[PDB]
Amino acid sequence: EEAFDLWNECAKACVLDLKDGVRSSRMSVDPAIADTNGQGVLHYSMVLEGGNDALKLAIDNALSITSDGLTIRLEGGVEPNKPVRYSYTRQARGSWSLNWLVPIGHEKPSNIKVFIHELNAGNQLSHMSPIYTIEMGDELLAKLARDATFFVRAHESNEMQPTLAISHAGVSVVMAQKRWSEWASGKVLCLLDPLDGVYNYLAQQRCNLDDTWEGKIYRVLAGNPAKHDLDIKPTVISHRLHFPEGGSLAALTAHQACHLPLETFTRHRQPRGWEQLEQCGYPVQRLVALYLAARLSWNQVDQVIRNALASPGSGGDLGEAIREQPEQARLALTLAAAESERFVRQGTGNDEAGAANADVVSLTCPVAAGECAGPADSGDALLERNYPTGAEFLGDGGDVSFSTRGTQNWTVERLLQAHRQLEERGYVFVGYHGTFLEAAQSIVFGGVRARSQDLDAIWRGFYIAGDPALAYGYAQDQEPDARGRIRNGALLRVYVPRSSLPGFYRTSLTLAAPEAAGEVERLIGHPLPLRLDAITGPEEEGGRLETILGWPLAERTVVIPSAIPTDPRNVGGDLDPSSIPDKEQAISALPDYASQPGK
């Protein structure tokens, strides 16, 4: 009576009577699937048609959807108290597809993904909602992938006898040939047959999946999932993550500074033994949390750090966290500062206090387009713009990491291969960036991110230098140690898409001159700071050149290691030209920059 069989009755099309109360259907999948020894993703979907605008649906109490015709509200999760909550604003009227992904495997993520596809009259995919993440924990995920109940009830319906029409209800499973990198990014869509081509179109790049998911095999387990023809609005793929107990800025900073998935920080259970999480992740998360609690305006990060390092035992808990890892503290706090500032300047309703707990919206950004903008409803969120990073262009040779002993598994041979791969993907070398070890990890793997800087706002941006000898001066820590030793850093190679070259300008005017600002603004055609453009000019009168990439452009760079090593025995010394591999020099000429504004 109240029960129904979703995958039998609604695989093609069903009309469910809701006039007598909630309707329910058990969703059971072979337990052998949830207990697989490899990795996979169960993709549950259904198309909701007539009656989809006055409905409250739920999978157990784990996931609940409320659709009133204007929005689709989603909430749930395993944790009590305030649940994980999201709200999607309908961009169309009509049918929409409900989708949720449940990962399976022994080292799987502990959350599910949920997304909506709005469909037009012709059953074409017209709009896709952000991909929402809801924390479930391992046991509830097992339950969601074995036996859960689907509930549907009418909600504020204007119908005398409300009904809900469902079509193409079903579940499929994709098995990989363990990496879950795609899961947290826009590439998660590349794992779903029904979405074939969506990533290529929206990201304007091939999925280029690694072997694991490249050789995936998919099977429909029940029902008859829909595969809609596309007619989607050109909107970048986005993810949204809500932090019920706050601390989003801290998690975002840890994720970007350490190159750790964002969702690691929203896990029901903390991972154990994860070295990078224990040494970088949690410490950075804690550092940002401490700074926010001290109610210090992010504009004083530099002084807060100087004071903490100047007098031991000062600054309280925040001061001590800083002293424990100076450089990591500089990286984390300056990254958090820059993001909070952007957040506050986003809208009138955003303030420094709110940046600490705002949802995180992550965008899959095309590198050739203009600036990467988030959806209309992302104005109240922290934003992350993601582009290909050095992590994708290291080539073969084993894990790469930065150390005082040098860059692991990095040789001139490997570099030449990576450089060719970069050319094949449309990138071009524009210079060197020298920095400390933690920043190198962040930049190469996680990607370049804006950081607050102590200089006039108009000159804010990512600083690089065509001459490795100039960049070398910055490839180190900027503070001695208890043993009177400063760690050596790493020299990095910065690349940008060739399509970005028209935005690179040059001036013979020392960027330190009085009329510098005006001349650069004349060249770039807009007021500073730099946006999707760059300026190269002498660092000082009669000196070597420096290049500044506006942050928007900096984010779309690909940065990889240089084969030019830093010297642990001569930190502070000048680059020994004899240490520069001749073959690296051969791939280090710089592009021809524009000396006049565009006409």
Question: Does 433 appear as a known binding residue?
Answer: yes
Q: Please provide the DSSP assignment of 420-454 as one string.
A: HHHHHTTEEEEEEEEE-HHHHHIIIII-------S
Q: Do the bridges between strand 504-506 and strand 147-154 make them parallel or antiparallel, or are there none, so unpaired? A: unpaired
CB atoms within 10 A of CB 540: 12
Partners of 41 in the β-ladder: 103, 174
Nearer Cβ to Cl ion, position 412 or 594? Answer: 412
Question: Which of 327, 438, 546, 555 is flagged as catalytic?
Answer: 546
Question: Does 303 appear as a known binding residue?
Answer: no
Smallest distance, Na ion to C-beta of residue 241, A: 17
Q: Do the bridges between strand 360-364 and strand 382-386 make them parallel or antiparallel, or are there none, so unpaired? A: parallel
Smallest distance, Cl ion to C-beta of residue 13, A: 23
Q: Which residues contact 459 (CB under 8 A, 6 or more apart)?
A: 511, 528, 529, 548
Smallest distance, Na ion to C-beta of residue 449, A: 34
Residue 266 near residue 241, CB atoms below 8 Å: yes
d(CA 134, CA 524): 43
Residues 118-157: x/- map of binding to Cl ion (CB under 5 A)? ---------------------------------x-x----
Query: What is the CB-side half-sphere exposure of residue 87 using CA atoms within 13 A?
Result: 10
Question: Does 434 appear as a known binding residue?
Answer: yes
Determine, following the binding rule CB under 5 A, whether residue 581 of this chain makes contact with Cl ion: yes
Token output for 186: 């826009």
Smallest distance, Cl ion to C-beta of residue 432, A: 16
Determine, following the binding rule CB under 5 A, whether residue 582 of this chain makes contact with Cl ion: yes
Partner from Na ion, Cl ion, none contacting 268, C-beta within 5 to 8 A by type = none
- Active-site annotation holds for 546: yes
Cβ burial of 339 (10 Å; 0-12, 13-18, 19+) is buried
Nearer Cβ to Cl ion, position 214 or 413? Answer: 413
| Near Na ion in 50-69, by CB under 5 A | 53-54, 61, 68-69
Question: Does 448 appear as a known binding residue?
Answer: yes
Smallest distance, Cl ion to C-beta of residue 1, A: 15
**Binding span for Cl ion by CB under 5 A among 6-14, 21-29, 309-317, 537-545:** 21-29
Number of residues that bind Na ion (CB under 5 A): 6
Partner from Na ion, Cl ion, none contacting 151, C-beta within 5 to 8 A by type = Cl ion
Determine, following the binding rule CB under 5 A, whether residue 93 of this chain makes contact with Na ion: no
Determine, following the binding rule CB under 5 A, whether residue 73 of this chain makes contact with Cl ion: no
Identify the residue among 40, 51, 76, 130 touching Na ion (CB under 5 A): 76
Partner from Cl ion, Na ion, none contacting 428, C-beta within 5 to 8 A by type = none
Closest CA to 357 of 411, 293, 428: 293
Nearer Cβ to Cl ion, position 153 or 268? Answer: 153
The CA-based dihedral angle spanning residues 407, 408, 412, 417, taken in that order and rounded to the nearest 10 degrees: -120
ω before 529 within 30° of 0 (cis)? Answer: yes
Residue 328 near residue 437, CB atoms below 8 Å: no
Residues with active-site annotation: 546
Q: Which residues bind Cl ion (CB under 5 A)?
A: 22, 151, 153, 412, 581-583
The annotated binding site for NAD(+) is made up of 433-435, 442, 447-453, 546
